[PDB]
Amino acid sequence: NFTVLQTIRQQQSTLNGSWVALLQTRNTLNRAGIRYMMDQNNIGSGSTVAELMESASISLKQAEKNWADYEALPRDPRQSTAAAAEIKRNYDIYHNALAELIQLLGAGKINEFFDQPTQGYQDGFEKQYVAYMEQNDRLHDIAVSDNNASY
Amino acid sequence: ENFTVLQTIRQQQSTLNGSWVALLQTRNTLNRAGIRYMMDQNNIGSGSTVAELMESASISLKQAEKNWADYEALPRDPRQSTAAAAEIKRNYDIYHNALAELIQLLGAGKINEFFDQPTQGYQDGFEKQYVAYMEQNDRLHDIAVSDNNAS
């Protein structure tokens, strides 16, 4: 009881961070596509393309890592192994186009990149992430429900 | 009592999160429109037009205010800092506005200052309190759960 509650909650904790980090990564990568762009009309504001890249790396790995602390969180006998497997592959697709994005940029061909239906992968993840959360909020209360009762 | 303090903290945390997440998606979508533009003004133009990109930014942004509003409407706990709540709201207002402007700043098409706004600054400005509010609240939750478990 008392214990299935930090687990499920360190899982949220951890999965949110990953979520946010992928999102910060996407937006950064997008300020690179932006500045590589004025950088081709021989202009450029704020920061070099390049720092956005590395800043794009530091965050994707912060993302890759938060995701690892999650996975390493041990599942309650009550959590669907199919559920977990579903968010993970959506996390895997999203994540990957993100990684693939960067490359596209370093490879400089910028039309191949704006066209990656990243929105589709992100959403694919957003859904499971919420479904997951819902699954966990429900389990969570279910536990609180047997304790506060059994007490 | 502890239901009262936990069905609510868990609730400020989730509402506040969706909003935080809607601010990033909006920022991101704004940069995709940013790119789309140059590509449109220059020669080649891949994917989603500028206008579609720009009203999503507009929708997801509203999505942010709604979550902020759901958050605010949440009755505060007596031990929750009221300067914390006001400091987050302040960073939320400036970041939120930083983005509401980037937009028309785009209908106005000057794609130049657009990339120049200290947005990256206003964000961690926000992301900085959002995280302390989270910190303080979590910490308020353990403490919280300890009194009733104490009784």
PDB file of C-alpha atoms in Angstrom:
ATOM      1  CA  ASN A   1       0.000   0.000   0.000  1.00  0.00           C
ATOM      2  CA  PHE A   2       2.098   2.872   1.341  1.00  0.00           C
ATOM      3  CA  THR A   3       4.776   1.613  -1.015  1.00  0.00           C
ATOM      4  CA  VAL A   4       2.946   1.133  -4.338  1.00  0.00           C
ATOM      5  CA  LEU A   5       2.383   4.864  -3.983  1.00  0.00           C
ATOM      6  CA  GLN A   6       5.925   6.238  -4.406  1.00  0.00           C
ATOM      7  CA  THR A   7       6.629   3.832  -7.211  1.00  0.00           C
ATOM      8  CA  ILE A   8       3.635   4.858  -9.274  1.00  0.00           C
ATOM      9  CA  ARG A   9       4.435   8.443  -8.381  1.00  0.00           C
ATOM     10  CA  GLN A  10       8.138   8.319  -9.174  1.00  0.00           C
ATOM     11  CA  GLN A  11       7.005   6.872 -12.501  1.00  0.00           C
ATOM     12  CA  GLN A  12       4.841   9.918 -13.210  1.00  0.00           C
ATOM     13  CA  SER A  13       7.593  12.183 -11.929  1.00  0.00           C
ATOM     14  CA  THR A  14      10.078  10.548 -14.214  1.00  0.00           C
ATOM     15  CA  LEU A  15       7.842  10.222 -17.265  1.00  0.00           C
ATOM     16  CA  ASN A  16       6.826  13.895 -17.093  1.00  0.00           C
ATOM     17  CA  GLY A  17      10.424  14.999 -17.132  1.00  0.00           C
ATOM     18  CA  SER A  18      11.120  12.897 -20.178  1.00  0.00           C
ATOM     19  CA  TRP A  19       7.972  14.292 -21.789  1.00  0.00           C
ATOM     20  CA  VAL A  20       8.985  17.866 -21.079  1.00  0.00           C
ATOM     21  CA  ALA A  21      12.569  17.214 -22.249  1.00  0.00           C
ATOM     22  CA  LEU A  22      11.496  15.836 -25.604  1.00  0.00           C
ATOM     23  CA  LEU A  23       9.284  18.875 -25.985  1.00  0.00           C
ATOM     24  CA  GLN A  24      12.056  21.282 -25.111  1.00  0.00           C
ATOM     25  CA  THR A  25      14.240  19.409 -27.539  1.00  0.00           C
ATOM     26  CA  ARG A  26      11.762  19.725 -30.372  1.00  0.00           C
ATOM     27  CA  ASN A  27      11.421  23.471 -29.870  1.00  0.00           C
ATOM     28  CA  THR A  28      15.155  23.986 -29.647  1.00  0.00           C
ATOM     29  CA  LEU A  29      15.784  21.950 -32.770  1.00  0.00           C
ATOM     30  CA  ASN A  30      13.224  24.331 -34.245  1.00  0.00           C
ATOM     31  CA  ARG A  31      15.213  27.430 -33.346  1.00  0.00           C
ATOM     32  CA  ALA A  32      18.113  25.842 -35.154  1.00  0.00           C
ATOM     33  CA  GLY A  33      16.088  25.319 -38.291  1.00  0.00           C
ATOM     34  CA  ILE A  34      15.187  28.950 -37.814  1.00  0.00           C
ATOM     35  CA  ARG A  35      18.659  30.362 -37.378  1.00  0.00           C
ATOM     36  CA  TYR A  36      20.295  28.064 -39.920  1.00  0.00           C
ATOM     37  CA  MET A  37      17.735  29.707 -42.125  1.00  0.00           C
ATOM     38  CA  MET A  38      18.604  33.395 -41.670  1.00  0.00           C
ATOM     39  CA  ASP A  39      22.132  31.972 -41.720  1.00  0.00           C
ATOM     40  CA  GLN A  40      21.476  31.307 -45.497  1.00  0.00           C
ATOM     41  CA  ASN A  41      20.427  34.768 -46.284  1.00  0.00           C
ATOM     42  CA  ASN A  42      23.694  35.647 -44.540  1.00  0.00           C
ATOM     43  CA  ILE A  43      22.113  36.925 -41.311  1.00  0.00           C
ATOM     44  CA  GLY A  44      21.485  35.457 -37.873  1.00  0.00           C
ATOM     45  CA  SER A  45      20.077  36.535 -34.532  1.00  0.00           C
ATOM     46  CA  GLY A  46      20.531  35.461 -30.907  1.00  0.00           C
ATOM     47  CA  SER A  47      22.553  32.298 -30.948  1.00  0.00           C
ATOM     48  CA  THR A  48      24.595  30.449 -33.481  1.00  0.00           C
ATOM     49  CA  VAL A  49      22.941  27.468 -35.050  1.00  0.00           C
ATOM     50  CA  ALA A  50      25.504  25.193 -33.428  1.00  0.00           C
ATOM     51  CA  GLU A  51      24.779  25.992 -29.762  1.00  0.00           C
ATOM     52  CA  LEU A  52      21.159  25.131 -30.315  1.00  0.00           C
ATOM     53  CA  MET A  53      22.420  21.748 -31.572  1.00  0.00           C
ATOM     54  CA  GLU A  54      24.459  20.941 -28.497  1.00  0.00           C
ATOM     55  CA  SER A  55      21.698  22.437 -26.349  1.00  0.00           C
ATOM     56  CA  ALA A  56      19.482  20.181 -28.412  1.00  0.00           C
ATOM     57  CA  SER A  57      21.694  17.256 -27.415  1.00  0.00           C
ATOM     58  CA  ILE A  58      21.993  17.987 -23.716  1.00  0.00           C
ATOM     59  CA  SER A  59      18.191  18.012 -23.474  1.00  0.00           C
ATOM     60  CA  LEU A  60      17.430  14.924 -25.587  1.00  0.00           C
ATOM     61  CA  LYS A  61      19.835  12.983 -23.405  1.00  0.00           C
ATOM     62  CA  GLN A  62      18.236  14.531 -20.311  1.00  0.00           C
ATOM     63  CA  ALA A  63      15.142  13.147 -21.954  1.00  0.00           C
ATOM     64  CA  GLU A  64      16.706   9.770 -22.791  1.00  0.00           C
ATOM     65  CA  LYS A  65      17.791   9.533 -19.215  1.00  0.00           C
ATOM     66  CA  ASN A  66      14.612  10.504 -17.387  1.00  0.00           C
ATOM     67  CA  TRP A  67      13.030   7.838 -19.536  1.00  0.00           C
ATOM     68  CA  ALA A  68      15.558   5.346 -18.217  1.00  0.00           C
ATOM     69  CA  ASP A  69      14.855   6.117 -14.530  1.00  0.00           C
ATOM     70  CA  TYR A  70      11.243   5.421 -15.393  1.00  0.00           C
ATOM     71  CA  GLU A  71      11.761   2.109 -17.097  1.00  0.00           C
ATOM     72  CA  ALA A  72      14.000   1.145 -14.177  1.00  0.00           C
ATOM     73  CA  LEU A  73      11.060   1.799 -11.862  1.00  0.00           C
ATOM     74  CA  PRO A  74       9.702  -1.668 -10.965  1.00  0.00           C
ATOM     75  CA  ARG A  75       6.094  -2.362 -11.903  1.00  0.00           C
ATOM     76  CA  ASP A  76       3.354  -3.144  -9.442  1.00  0.00           C
ATOM     77  CA  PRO A  77       1.843  -6.638 -10.069  1.00  0.00           C
ATOM     78  CA  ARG A  78      -1.218  -4.587 -11.077  1.00  0.00           C
ATOM     79  CA  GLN A  79       0.218  -2.640 -14.013  1.00  0.00           C
ATOM     80  CA  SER A  80      -0.387  -3.842 -17.566  1.00  0.00           C
ATOM     81  CA  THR A  81       2.814  -4.998 -19.273  1.00  0.00           C
ATOM     82  CA  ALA A  82       1.007  -4.225 -22.533  1.00  0.00           C
ATOM     83  CA  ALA A  83       0.328  -0.682 -21.382  1.00  0.00           C
ATOM     84  CA  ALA A  84       3.983  -0.022 -20.567  1.00  0.00           C
ATOM     85  CA  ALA A  85       5.083  -1.572 -23.864  1.00  0.00           C
ATOM     86  CA  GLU A  86       2.761   0.806 -25.690  1.00  0.00           C
ATOM     87  CA  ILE A  87       4.002   4.108 -24.271  1.00  0.00           C
ATOM     88  CA  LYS A  88       7.572   2.919 -24.676  1.00  0.00           C
ATOM     89  CA  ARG A  89       7.289   2.345 -28.399  1.00  0.00           C
ATOM     90  CA  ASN A  90       5.542   5.692 -28.845  1.00  0.00           C
ATOM     91  CA  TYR A  91       8.264   7.210 -26.713  1.00  0.00           C
ATOM     92  CA  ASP A  92      10.702   5.374 -28.954  1.00  0.00           C
ATOM     93  CA  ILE A  93       9.243   6.692 -32.180  1.00  0.00           C
ATOM     94  CA  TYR A  94       8.943  10.288 -30.990  1.00  0.00           C
ATOM     95  CA  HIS A  95      12.400  10.228 -29.434  1.00  0.00           C
ATOM     96  CA  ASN A  96      13.928   8.808 -32.579  1.00  0.00           C
ATOM     97  CA  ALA A  97      12.631  11.337 -35.094  1.00  0.00           C
ATOM     98  CA  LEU A  98      13.986  13.882 -32.659  1.00  0.00           C
ATOM     99  CA  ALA A  99      17.411  12.267 -32.862  1.00  0.00           C
ATOM    100  CA  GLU A 100      16.906  11.867 -36.593  1.00  0.00           C
ATOM    101  CA  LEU A 101      16.019  15.563 -36.797  1.00  0.00           C
ATOM    102  CA  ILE A 102      19.332  16.882 -35.465  1.00  0.00           C
ATOM    103  CA  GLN A 103      21.189  14.778 -38.032  1.00  0.00           C
ATOM    104  CA  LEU A 104      19.060  16.234 -40.805  1.00  0.00           C
ATOM    105  CA  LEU A 105      20.174  19.674 -39.657  1.00  0.00           C
ATOM    106  CA  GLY A 106      23.867  18.891 -39.331  1.00  0.00           C
ATOM    107  CA  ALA A 107      23.371  17.297 -42.771  1.00  0.00           C
ATOM    108  CA  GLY A 108      21.834  20.700 -43.409  1.00  0.00           C
ATOM    109  CA  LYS A 109      19.132  19.564 -45.657  1.00  0.00           C
ATOM    110  CA  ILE A 110      16.328  21.447 -44.046  1.00  0.00           C
ATOM    111  CA  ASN A 111      13.393  20.574 -46.284  1.00  0.00           C
ATOM    112  CA  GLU A 112      13.590  16.878 -45.484  1.00  0.00           C
ATOM    113  CA  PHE A 113      13.260  17.859 -41.751  1.00  0.00           C
ATOM    114  CA  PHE A 114      10.354  20.380 -41.652  1.00  0.00           C
ATOM    115  CA  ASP A 115       8.487  17.623 -43.454  1.00  0.00           C
ATOM    116  CA  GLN A 116       9.020  14.915 -40.941  1.00  0.00           C
ATOM    117  CA  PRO A 117       5.526  14.429 -39.445  1.00  0.00           C
ATOM    118  CA  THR A 118       6.976  14.931 -35.980  1.00  0.00           C
ATOM    119  CA  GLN A 119       3.594  16.251 -34.816  1.00  0.00           C
ATOM    120  CA  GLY A 120       2.249  12.785 -35.509  1.00  0.00           C
ATOM    121  CA  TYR A 121       4.828  11.046 -33.332  1.00  0.00           C
ATOM    122  CA  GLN A 122       4.595  13.549 -30.545  1.00  0.00           C
ATOM    123  CA  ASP A 123       0.855  13.068 -30.427  1.00  0.00           C
ATOM    124  CA  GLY A 124       1.281   9.328 -30.587  1.00  0.00           C
ATOM    125  CA  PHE A 125       3.175   9.715 -27.338  1.00  0.00           C
ATOM    126  CA  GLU A 126       0.994  12.363 -25.748  1.00  0.00           C
ATOM    127  CA  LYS A 127      -1.910   9.899 -25.942  1.00  0.00           C
ATOM    128  CA  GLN A 128      -0.223   6.936 -24.234  1.00  0.00           C
ATOM    129  CA  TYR A 129       1.310   9.295 -21.705  1.00  0.00           C
ATOM    130  CA  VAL A 130      -2.143  10.464 -20.746  1.00  0.00           C
ATOM    131  CA  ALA A 131      -3.621   6.999 -20.992  1.00  0.00           C
ATOM    132  CA  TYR A 132      -0.800   5.819 -18.766  1.00  0.00           C
ATOM    133  CA  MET A 133      -1.283   8.606 -16.273  1.00  0.00           C
ATOM    134  CA  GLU A 134      -5.015   7.829 -16.171  1.00  0.00           C
ATOM    135  CA  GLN A 135      -4.209   4.154 -15.626  1.00  0.00           C
ATOM    136  CA  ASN A 136      -1.920   5.138 -12.746  1.00  0.00           C
ATOM    137  CA  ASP A 137      -4.230   7.710 -11.159  1.00  0.00           C
ATOM    138  CA  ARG A 138      -6.830   4.970 -11.105  1.00  0.00           C
ATOM    139  CA  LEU A 139      -4.508   2.404  -9.587  1.00  0.00           C
ATOM    140  CA  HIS A 140      -3.270   4.971  -7.107  1.00  0.00           C
ATOM    141  CA  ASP A 141      -6.729   5.720  -5.741  1.00  0.00           C
ATOM    142  CA  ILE A 142      -7.500   1.996  -5.820  1.00  0.00           C
ATOM    143  CA  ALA A 143      -4.675   1.493  -3.322  1.00  0.00           C
ATOM    144  CA  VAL A 144      -5.583   4.454  -1.107  1.00  0.00           C
ATOM    145  CA  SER A 145      -8.961   2.756  -1.197  1.00  0.00           C
ATOM    146  CA  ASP A 146      -7.868  -0.549   0.383  1.00  0.00           C
ATOM    147  CA  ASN A 147      -5.693   1.075   3.035  1.00  0.00           C
ATOM    148  CA  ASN A 148      -8.011   3.802   4.323  1.00  0.00           C
ATOM    149  CA  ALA A 149     -10.473   0.943   4.448  1.00  0.00           C
ATOM    150  CA  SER A 150      -8.358  -1.842   5.941  1.00  0.00           C
ATOM    151  CA  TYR A 151      -6.785   0.589   8.436  1.00  0.00           C
TER     152      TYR A 151
ATOM    153  CA  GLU B   1      -8.804  16.343   5.608  1.00  0.00           C
ATOM    154  CA  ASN B   2      -5.847  14.661   3.950  1.00  0.00           C
ATOM    155  CA  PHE B   3      -8.143  13.909   1.071  1.00  0.00           C
ATOM    156  CA  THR B   4      -8.868  17.640   1.022  1.00  0.00           C
ATOM    157  CA  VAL B   5      -5.152  18.440   0.928  1.00  0.00           C
ATOM    158  CA  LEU B   6      -4.208  15.740  -1.559  1.00  0.00           C
ATOM    159  CA  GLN B   7      -7.048  15.650  -4.086  1.00  0.00           C
ATOM    160  CA  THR B   8      -6.124  19.275  -4.427  1.00  0.00           C
ATOM    161  CA  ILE B   9      -2.335  19.370  -4.480  1.00  0.00           C
ATOM    162  CA  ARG B  10      -2.279  16.505  -6.992  1.00  0.00           C
ATOM    163  CA  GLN B  11      -4.703  18.704  -8.880  1.00  0.00           C
ATOM    164  CA  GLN B  12      -2.718  21.937  -8.879  1.00  0.00           C
ATOM    165  CA  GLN B  13       0.230  19.873 -10.015  1.00  0.00           C
ATOM    166  CA  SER B  14      -1.575  18.307 -12.926  1.00  0.00           C
ATOM    167  CA  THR B  15      -3.400  21.420 -14.125  1.00  0.00           C
ATOM    168  CA  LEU B  16      -0.278  23.510 -13.798  1.00  0.00           C
ATOM    169  CA  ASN B  17       1.587  20.811 -15.772  1.00  0.00           C
ATOM    170  CA  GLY B  18      -0.800  20.687 -18.715  1.00  0.00           C
ATOM    171  CA  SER B  19      -0.471  24.428 -18.963  1.00  0.00           C
ATOM    172  CA  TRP B  20       3.292  24.317 -18.737  1.00  0.00           C
ATOM    173  CA  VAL B  21       3.127  21.664 -21.460  1.00  0.00           C
ATOM    174  CA  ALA B  22       0.784  23.777 -23.603  1.00  0.00           C
ATOM    175  CA  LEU B  23       3.168  26.714 -23.360  1.00  0.00           C
ATOM    176  CA  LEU B  24       5.996  24.648 -24.851  1.00  0.00           C
ATOM    177  CA  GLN B  25       3.887  23.156 -27.594  1.00  0.00           C
ATOM    178  CA  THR B  26       2.814  26.660 -28.462  1.00  0.00           C
ATOM    179  CA  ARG B  27       6.327  27.975 -28.430  1.00  0.00           C
ATOM    180  CA  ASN B  28       7.382  25.060 -30.663  1.00  0.00           C
ATOM    181  CA  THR B  29       4.565  25.461 -33.115  1.00  0.00           C
ATOM    182  CA  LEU B  30       5.522  29.115 -33.292  1.00  0.00           C
ATOM    183  CA  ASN B  31       9.029  28.260 -34.486  1.00  0.00           C
ATOM    184  CA  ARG B  32       7.736  25.793 -37.063  1.00  0.00           C
ATOM    185  CA  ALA B  33       5.692  28.683 -38.444  1.00  0.00           C
ATOM    186  CA  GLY B  34       8.840  30.782 -38.199  1.00  0.00           C
ATOM    187  CA  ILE B  35      10.714  28.344 -40.470  1.00  0.00           C
ATOM    188  CA  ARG B  36       7.716  27.801 -42.767  1.00  0.00           C
ATOM    189  CA  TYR B  37       7.814  31.530 -43.432  1.00  0.00           C
ATOM    190  CA  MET B  38      11.374  31.922 -44.655  1.00  0.00           C
ATOM    191  CA  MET B  39      10.783  28.815 -46.750  1.00  0.00           C
ATOM    192  CA  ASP B  40       7.642  30.509 -48.030  1.00  0.00           C
ATOM    193  CA  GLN B  41       9.317  33.904 -48.554  1.00  0.00           C
ATOM    194  CA  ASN B  42      12.439  32.331 -50.044  1.00  0.00           C
ATOM    195  CA  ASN B  43      11.883  29.492 -52.574  1.00  0.00           C
ATOM    196  CA  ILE B  44      10.949  26.059 -51.180  1.00  0.00           C
ATOM    197  CA  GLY B  45       8.075  25.415 -48.793  1.00  0.00           C
ATOM    198  CA  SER B  46       7.556  22.050 -47.172  1.00  0.00           C
ATOM    199  CA  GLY B  47       4.766  20.801 -44.964  1.00  0.00           C
ATOM    200  CA  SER B  48       2.090  22.738 -43.112  1.00  0.00           C
ATOM    201  CA  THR B  49       1.485  26.272 -44.291  1.00  0.00           C
ATOM    202  CA  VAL B  50       2.166  29.320 -42.063  1.00  0.00           C
ATOM    203  CA  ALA B  51      -1.460  30.027 -41.224  1.00  0.00           C
ATOM    204  CA  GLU B  52      -2.362  26.540 -40.028  1.00  0.00           C
ATOM    205  CA  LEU B  53       0.777  26.460 -37.920  1.00  0.00           C
ATOM    206  CA  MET B  54      -0.136  29.838 -36.596  1.00  0.00           C
ATOM    207  CA  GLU B  55      -3.667  29.130 -35.377  1.00  0.00           C
ATOM    208  CA  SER B  56      -2.669  25.887 -33.699  1.00  0.00           C
ATOM    209  CA  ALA B  57      -0.225  28.013 -31.784  1.00  0.00           C
ATOM    210  CA  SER B  58      -3.339  30.030 -31.155  1.00  0.00           C
ATOM    211  CA  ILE B  59      -5.426  27.036 -30.037  1.00  0.00           C
ATOM    212  CA  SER B  60      -2.799  25.247 -27.927  1.00  0.00           C
ATOM    213  CA  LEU B  61      -2.114  28.655 -26.359  1.00  0.00           C
ATOM    214  CA  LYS B  62      -5.710  29.079 -25.307  1.00  0.00           C
ATOM    215  CA  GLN B  63      -5.348  25.516 -24.058  1.00  0.00           C
ATOM    216  CA  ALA B  64      -2.664  26.913 -21.794  1.00  0.00           C
ATOM    217  CA  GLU B  65      -4.773  29.688 -20.274  1.00  0.00           C
ATOM    218  CA  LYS B  66      -7.559  27.261 -19.615  1.00  0.00           C
ATOM    219  CA  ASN B  67      -5.222  24.993 -17.690  1.00  0.00           C
ATOM    220  CA  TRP B  68      -3.812  27.983 -15.863  1.00  0.00           C
ATOM    221  CA  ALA B  69      -7.345  29.007 -14.997  1.00  0.00           C
ATOM    222  CA  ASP B  70      -8.323  25.505 -13.812  1.00  0.00           C
ATOM    223  CA  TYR B  71      -5.196  25.731 -11.683  1.00  0.00           C
ATOM    224  CA  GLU B  72      -5.871  29.118 -10.170  1.00  0.00           C
ATOM    225  CA  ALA B  73      -9.469  28.215  -9.366  1.00  0.00           C
ATOM    226  CA  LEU B  74      -8.070  25.467  -7.163  1.00  0.00           C
ATOM    227  CA  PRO B  75      -8.528  26.485  -3.505  1.00  0.00           C
ATOM    228  CA  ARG B  76      -5.143  27.033  -1.886  1.00  0.00           C
ATOM    229  CA  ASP B  77      -3.865  25.223   1.216  1.00  0.00           C
ATOM    230  CA  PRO B  78      -3.256  27.410   4.340  1.00  0.00           C
ATOM    231  CA  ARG B  79       0.399  26.423   4.458  1.00  0.00           C
ATOM    232  CA  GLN B  80       1.101  27.089   0.789  1.00  0.00           C
ATOM    233  CA  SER B  81       3.241  30.187   0.208  1.00  0.00           C
ATOM    234  CA  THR B  82       1.202  33.055  -1.255  1.00  0.00           C
ATOM    235  CA  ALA B  83       4.282  34.757  -2.723  1.00  0.00           C
ATOM    236  CA  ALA B  84       5.230  31.476  -4.313  1.00  0.00           C
ATOM    237  CA  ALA B  85       1.774  31.377  -5.911  1.00  0.00           C
ATOM    238  CA  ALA B  86       2.248  35.002  -7.011  1.00  0.00           C
ATOM    239  CA  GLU B  87       5.789  34.555  -8.244  1.00  0.00           C
ATOM    240  CA  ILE B  88       4.797  31.648 -10.458  1.00  0.00           C
ATOM    241  CA  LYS B  89       1.782  33.604 -11.723  1.00  0.00           C
ATOM    242  CA  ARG B  90       4.068  36.466 -12.612  1.00  0.00           C
ATOM    243  CA  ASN B  91       6.550  34.323 -14.587  1.00  0.00           C
ATOM    244  CA  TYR B  92       3.489  32.631 -16.118  1.00  0.00           C
ATOM    245  CA  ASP B  93       2.036  35.959 -17.228  1.00  0.00           C
ATOM    246  CA  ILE B  94       5.243  37.209 -18.850  1.00  0.00           C
ATOM    247  CA  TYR B  95       6.097  33.922 -20.548  1.00  0.00           C
ATOM    248  CA  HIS B  96       2.479  33.598 -21.646  1.00  0.00           C
ATOM    249  CA  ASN B  97       2.544  37.077 -23.051  1.00  0.00           C
ATOM    250  CA  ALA B  98       5.997  36.656 -24.544  1.00  0.00           C
ATOM    251  CA  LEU B  99       4.236  34.139 -26.814  1.00  0.00           C
ATOM    252  CA  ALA B 100       0.947  35.984 -27.440  1.00  0.00           C
ATOM    253  CA  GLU B 101       3.125  38.681 -28.985  1.00  0.00           C
ATOM    254  CA  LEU B 102       5.503  36.469 -31.018  1.00  0.00           C
ATOM    255  CA  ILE B 103       2.350  35.693 -32.990  1.00  0.00           C
ATOM    256  CA  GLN B 104       1.072  38.952 -34.515  1.00  0.00           C
ATOM    257  CA  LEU B 105       4.739  39.873 -34.478  1.00  0.00           C
ATOM    258  CA  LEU B 106       4.442  37.274 -37.251  1.00  0.00           C
ATOM    259  CA  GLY B 107       1.251  38.407 -38.950  1.00  0.00           C
ATOM    260  CA  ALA B 108       3.376  41.490 -39.155  1.00  0.00           C
ATOM    261  CA  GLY B 109       5.793  39.046 -40.670  1.00  0.00           C
ATOM    262  CA  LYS B 110       8.867  40.527 -39.274  1.00  0.00           C
ATOM    263  CA  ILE B 111      10.559  37.305 -38.892  1.00  0.00           C
ATOM    264  CA  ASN B 112      13.569  39.230 -37.659  1.00  0.00           C
ATOM    265  CA  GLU B 113      12.764  40.535 -34.209  1.00  0.00           C
ATOM    266  CA  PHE B 114      10.606  37.425 -33.773  1.00  0.00           C
ATOM    267  CA  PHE B 115      13.691  35.211 -33.501  1.00  0.00           C
ATOM    268  CA  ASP B 116      15.187  37.855 -31.211  1.00  0.00           C
ATOM    269  CA  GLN B 117      12.706  38.058 -28.320  1.00  0.00           C
ATOM    270  CA  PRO B 118      14.252  36.852 -25.040  1.00  0.00           C
ATOM    271  CA  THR B 119      11.815  33.959 -25.089  1.00  0.00           C
ATOM    272  CA  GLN B 120      14.314  31.332 -24.054  1.00  0.00           C
ATOM    273  CA  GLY B 121      14.774  33.677 -21.099  1.00  0.00           C
ATOM    274  CA  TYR B 122      11.118  34.138 -20.134  1.00  0.00           C
ATOM    275  CA  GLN B 123      10.635  30.364 -20.206  1.00  0.00           C
ATOM    276  CA  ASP B 124      13.149  29.132 -17.642  1.00  0.00           C
ATOM    277  CA  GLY B 125      11.934  32.252 -15.946  1.00  0.00           C
ATOM    278  CA  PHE B 126       8.693  30.320 -15.714  1.00  0.00           C
ATOM    279  CA  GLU B 127      10.161  26.807 -15.607  1.00  0.00           C
ATOM    280  CA  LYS B 128      12.047  28.011 -12.567  1.00  0.00           C
ATOM    281  CA  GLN B 129       9.041  28.673 -10.284  1.00  0.00           C
ATOM    282  CA  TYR B 130       6.940  25.911 -11.778  1.00  0.00           C
ATOM    283  CA  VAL B 131       9.655  23.628 -10.460  1.00  0.00           C
ATOM    284  CA  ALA B 132       9.826  25.161  -6.983  1.00  0.00           C
ATOM    285  CA  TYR B 133       6.072  25.146  -6.652  1.00  0.00           C
ATOM    286  CA  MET B 134       6.336  21.436  -7.526  1.00  0.00           C
ATOM    287  CA  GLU B 135       9.126  21.011  -5.030  1.00  0.00           C
ATOM    288  CA  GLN B 136       7.324  22.851  -2.227  1.00  0.00           C
ATOM    289  CA  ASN B 137       4.093  21.008  -2.935  1.00  0.00           C
ATOM    290  CA  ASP B 138       5.609  17.541  -3.037  1.00  0.00           C
ATOM    291  CA  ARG B 139       7.378  18.362   0.185  1.00  0.00           C
ATOM    292  CA  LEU B 140       4.009  19.587   1.484  1.00  0.00           C
ATOM    293  CA  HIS B 141       2.526  16.240   0.524  1.00  0.00           C
ATOM    294  CA  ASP B 142       4.909  13.975   2.420  1.00  0.00           C
ATOM    295  CA  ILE B 143       4.516  16.197   5.470  1.00  0.00           C
ATOM    296  CA  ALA B 144       0.801  16.224   4.727  1.00  0.00           C
ATOM    297  CA  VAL B 145       0.476  12.445   4.525  1.00  0.00           C
ATOM    298  CA  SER B 146       2.446  12.085   7.711  1.00  0.00           C
ATOM    299  CA  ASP B 147      -0.106  13.654  10.092  1.00  0.00           C
ATOM    300  CA  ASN B 148      -3.069  11.394   9.152  1.00  0.00           C
ATOM    301  CA  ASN B 149      -0.781   8.412   9.021  1.00  0.00           C
ATOM    302  CA  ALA B 150       0.346   9.852  12.345  1.00  0.00           C
ATOM    303  CA  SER B 151      -3.156   9.721  13.776  1.00  0.00           C
TER     304      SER B 151
END
